[PDB]
Amino acid sequence: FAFKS
């Protein structure tokens, strides 16, 4: 899981 920017 990752943050989306």
Place this chain on the structure above:
Amino acid sequence: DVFEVEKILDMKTEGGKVLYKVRWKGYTSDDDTWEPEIHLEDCKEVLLEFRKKIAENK
């Protein structure tokens, strides 16, 4: 603001920092983004999969 990652597609530097191109699970190439390393601390599995594919085509 957190989403599941399908795979890492490529890497690049920009202004002295590393970014990784992310294929998001359940999305297409139209939704790919470039993400800094900071955002991928939970993605160690898929990053080493990526870095292994780079090493092998070499």
